[PDB]
Amino acid sequence: CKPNFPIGQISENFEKSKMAKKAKLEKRRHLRELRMRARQTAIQLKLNPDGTMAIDEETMVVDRHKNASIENEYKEKVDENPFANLYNYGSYGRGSYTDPWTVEEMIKFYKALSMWGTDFNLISQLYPYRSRKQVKAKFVNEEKKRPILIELALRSKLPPNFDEYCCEIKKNIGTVADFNEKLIELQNEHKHHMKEIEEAKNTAKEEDQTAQRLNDAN
């Protein structure tokens, strides 16, 4: 009769303890559903025969709750069992579980670590929905387990096997534009629009000076 799970007597009111444990199986499971698919009201009026072109009393003001009411109505209605909202030390905290890395992504990583020295800025976009923090945690990870390939990444300071020319442009095909000076020309447009604004502002400053002098003499 081990200390792990003997069924041994009356055990009253465990049907909600059982099913909420069974219901947590799917709450963790549909997190795995979403990860794999991630990879891939003016004023109104009226025509009254008595009073033509009359304004109505009710639409003068807005309720601000009826548009919130319909938003609430197509929401899920759940009956709370006190065992669902269980909290532990791992609650209301940072972080998540990173997807364990693949051999497909290794050849996208070590070649990026062979060409560049260690440049986490552009690796972060290469892995489209991965973040800056855990690729740095992978960098410290691969020192400990494979201590010899980070040496080979350091030692190779030359053009590698020249297959990366597509991988040069595989990064450069997303939104093809000369960013070295296309960033300049719309920034020039940004200050051009501002150069309108002071002209629209300072001519509005001088119209104040002519009117406030006119009623002084009046």
Residues within the interface to other proteins (CB under 8 A):
1-11, 13-14, 17-18, 20-21, 72, 75-80, 82-83, 86-93, 116-122, 125, 132, 150-151, 154, 157, 171-172, 175, 178-180, 183, 187, 190-191, 194, 197-198, 201
Closest CA to 121 of 171, 187, 182: 171
DSSP notation for 85-112: S---SSSS-S---PPPP-HHHHTTTHHH
Structure tokens at 147: 């201590």
Which position has the token pair 């219901």?
23
CB of 88 to other proteins, least distance (A): 5
Residue type, 188: N
Distances 54 to 45, 47, 49, 50, 85 between C-alpha atoms, Å? 6, 7, 10, 9, 55
Residue 1 C-alpha from the chain's centroid = 52
Q: Cα separation of 148 and 182, whole Å?
A: 43
CB of 82 to other proteins, least distance (A): 7
CB 53, CB 44: distance < 8 Å:
no
